[PDB]
Structure 1
Amino acid sequence: MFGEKAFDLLKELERSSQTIPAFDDDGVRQVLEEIKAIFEENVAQASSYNASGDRSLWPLLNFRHAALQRNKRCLLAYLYERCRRIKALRWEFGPIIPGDIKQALCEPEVTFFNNYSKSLAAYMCSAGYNQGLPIDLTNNLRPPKSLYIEVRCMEDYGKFELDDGEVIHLKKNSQHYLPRAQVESLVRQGILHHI
């Protein structure tokens, strides 16, 4: 408001807990149309004879400084909480099943997202094995059993199961030719509290 809105900025995701319909790129547009409205004054009097080198201008310096503080750190929040919750579900699956939308990528976030994906790439490479065994770590926790059967679940959408089946219809009654490598992604996104 004069530096308050970030609690309003995540509110696009207010309902999006684990029953999420979809997500969007809210709250940047007018808000960084600000920053080019203000730099004019922030560097207006740089070593100027506008006041002939006098002490009085010290509030202006700190004005710029705190403005930068608030802007940058709300940016860190709008970055880091997005990455962190998405990192939770991205530990609940690789890039097998990515986000519900991939339309709310705040455009530069391609680098951000994919770098963290390559965080897990490094993780896989060094960990698991020295050459790198991608170590099955947070999903598909069945003890050694059959490889190919389907079962019942509870209505997920997004429909991104590209893994090894023709079309499995990943919802309740995703009940078709499912191999093990097909069904390798789900433990908790809202799917199989019930076989």
Structure 2
Amino acid sequence: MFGEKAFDLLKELERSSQTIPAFDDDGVRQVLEEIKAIFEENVAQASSYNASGDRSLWPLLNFRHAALQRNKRCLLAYLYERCRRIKALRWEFGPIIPGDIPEVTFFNNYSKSLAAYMCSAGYNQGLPIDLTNNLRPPKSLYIEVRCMEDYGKFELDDGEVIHLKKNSQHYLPRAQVESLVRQGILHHI
């Protein structure tokens, strides 16, 4: 009412678990466009002589204060809730394959924040370190690929053209094939 609205948030990610068509930043307008619309209500008596310092604004100070209090930490979620399983697939891959579809500034900040990890990782000097692919013992470097209906088509890795779904298969070397595991790919090598 005054922000009980995330009960509505709950459905946006429903298909979007491991069969994601696409995401929406949506539904956010009046849950946003009221919030400091109603600051004007919050400021109506903010340091006002309307009652000259008595009880009568403390019970609604709580309205003034709770109103924020819920807005923030839900609005933590709107990225944090969105940072979580995106970090997870962004663990499943680095920025080898970002999202199939100021969050980019926070992602770039998170990518710069992850640098610390990368510095010690692999060596003192640092390696974006393989954590999520090639438990392969490495074999000969130039043999092709197979998938299980991947989608997004971000394979930018050193190949002729792969067309990243099942039968994304061309003469693709090891440098190419270093992308993904469990987003519709690894029935096969």
TM-score norm. by structure 2 comes to 0.92
The CA deviation at 1:62 is 1.0
Structure 1: gaps of 5 or more residues: 102-107
Residue correspondence of structure 1 range 1-195 to structure 2 within 5 A: 1-101=1-101, 108-195=102-189
* Aligned partners of 2:5 and 2:31 also within 8 Å: no
Q: 1:185 to 1:32 in 2, by over 3 A?
A: same
Q: CA contact under 8 A between 1:9 and 1:78: conserved in structure 2? A: no
1:140 and 1:185 in contact (8 A); partners too: no
Q: What SS does structure 2 have at the residue aligned with 1:77?
A: helix
Flag the 1:122–1:68 CA change in 2: closer, same or farther, 3 A: same
Counterparts of 1:65 and 1:141 in 2: how far apart (Å)? 52
CA contact (8 A) 2:13 2:23 kept: yes
Distance 1:7 1:179 in 2: 48
Deviations 1:57-78 (A, max 9, x none): 2122111110011100111122
Aligned partners of 2:3 and 2:31 also within 8 Å = no
Higher deviation after alignment, 134-143 or 159-168: 134-143
CA deviation map 1:54-110 (0-9, x unaligned): 222212211111001110011112221211100000010010111111xxxxxx112
Q: Once the two structures are aligned, what percentage of the paired residues are identical?
A: 100
What SS class does the counterpart of residue 36 from structure 2 fall into? helix
User: Is 2:149–2:165's contact at 8 Å kept on the other side of the alignment?
Assistant: yes
CA contact (8 A) 1:161 1:170 kept: yes
Residues 90 and 54 of structure 1, relative CA distance in 2, 3 Å threshold: same
Using the alignment, how far apart are the partners of 2:71 and 2:180 within structure 1? 38
* Structure 2 gap segments, 5+ residues each: none
1:7: how far off?
A: 3.4
Using the TM superposition, name which of 51-60 and 12-21 deviates more. 51-60
Q: Deviations over 1:109-152 (max 9, x none)?
A: 12211122223222111222111122211112211212111132
The alignment yields a C-alpha RMSD, in angstroms, of: 1.5
Cα 1:30/1:3, change in 2 over 3 Å: closer
| C-alpha contact (below 8 Å) 2:2/2:67 kept by paired residues | no
Q: Deviations over 1:141-175 (max 9, x none)?
A: 21121211113221112111111012111111111
Q: 1:187 to 1:37 in 2, by over 3 A?
A: same
Aligned to 1:91, the other structure's residue is in SS state: helix
Note the alpha carbon deviations across 1:17-73, whole angstroms, 9 max, x for none: 101111111222111101122111212223322123222221221111100111001
Question: For 1:115, what is the secondary structure of its paired residue?
Answer: helix
Deviates more, 1:148-157 or 1:88-97: 148-157
User: How far apart are 1:10 and its partner, in Å?
Assistant: 4.1
Structure 1 counterpart SS, 2:31: helix
Aligned length: 189
